[PDB]
């Protein structure tokens, strides 16, 4: 055959892969964590968006820290040989490096480790995407105007390190709303990083918080793309 290039991930396997959506809205009273109103809009938006991208979506609601770990481990033990990639969306409360189960925290590292190049062989060399809508701290943005086991991972964080992440009780989170809109519009045209860059701009420009509390009013947000990917990612093929 002619000259061949390996600049982009092979996305023409029989299946695009799984899209696991962990939607945590209601938390155990003892944790003291509030209900995440609007998260169902996010979960529904994501399901439809990835459905159109041909992913095998599995929506899970209100999972405990134990159930999250068990789910991830079981999914990582599946045979992904015929799957092009893997997507996991986490919608919940959080802190830096942590996402909350309904009854307690789960280190993000524990979840992602199940999918390491050496622990999930059927996903080795394939893109593993973790989309996280959760806080990464308590800072507010005031605004102005052999291959590595950690390789082939992409973390599409909703907010910058150490910052709160915003969610609208009626429209859903700023990040997820934007992510889904950008995917629906550009998934058949742009490489993934370029799509996520559009998401960054949308969140950064079109949203500003409104709150009766001066401390939380007029705040801005910027998502955080973290890539360990080794190739360009296009959801379309041929």
């Amino acid at each position: 055959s002619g000259i061949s290039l390996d600049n982009s991930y092979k996305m023409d396997y029989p299946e695009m892969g799984l899209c696991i959506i962990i939607n945590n809205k209601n938390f155990h009273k003892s944790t003291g964590m509030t209900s995440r109103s609007g998260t169902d809009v996010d979960a529904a938006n994501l399901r439809e968006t990835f459905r159109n991208l041909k992913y095998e979506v599995r929506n899970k609601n209100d999972l405990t820290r134990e159930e999250i770990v068990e789910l991830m481990r079981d999914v990582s033990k599946e045979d992904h040989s015929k799957r092009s990639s893997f997507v996991c969306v986490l919608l919940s409360h959080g802190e830096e490096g942590i996402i909350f189960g309904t009854n307690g925290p789960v280190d993000l590292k524990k979840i992602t480790n199940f999918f390491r190049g050496d622990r999930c062989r059927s996903l080795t060399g394939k893109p593993k995407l973790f989309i996280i809508q959760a806080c990464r701290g308590t800072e507010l943005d005031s605004g102005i105007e052999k291959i590595p086991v950690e390789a082939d991972f992409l973390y599409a964080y909703s907010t910058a390190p150490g910052y709160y992440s915003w969610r609208n009780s009626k429209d859903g989170s700023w990040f997820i709303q934007s992510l889904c809109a950008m995917l629906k519009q550009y998934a058949d045209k742009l490489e993934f990083m370029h799509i996520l860059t559009r998401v960054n701009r949308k969140v950064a420009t079109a949203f500003e918080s409104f709150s009766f509390d001066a401390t939380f009013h007029a705040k801005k947000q910027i998502p955080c793309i973290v890539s360990m990917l080794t190739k360009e990612l296009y959801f379309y093929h041929h």
Binding site: G38, Q133, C135, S165, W166, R167, N168, S173, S209, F216
Partner: peptide, 4 residues
């Protein structure tokens, strides 16, 4: 608007 609420924070997570």
């Amino acid at each position: 608007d609420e924070v997570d």
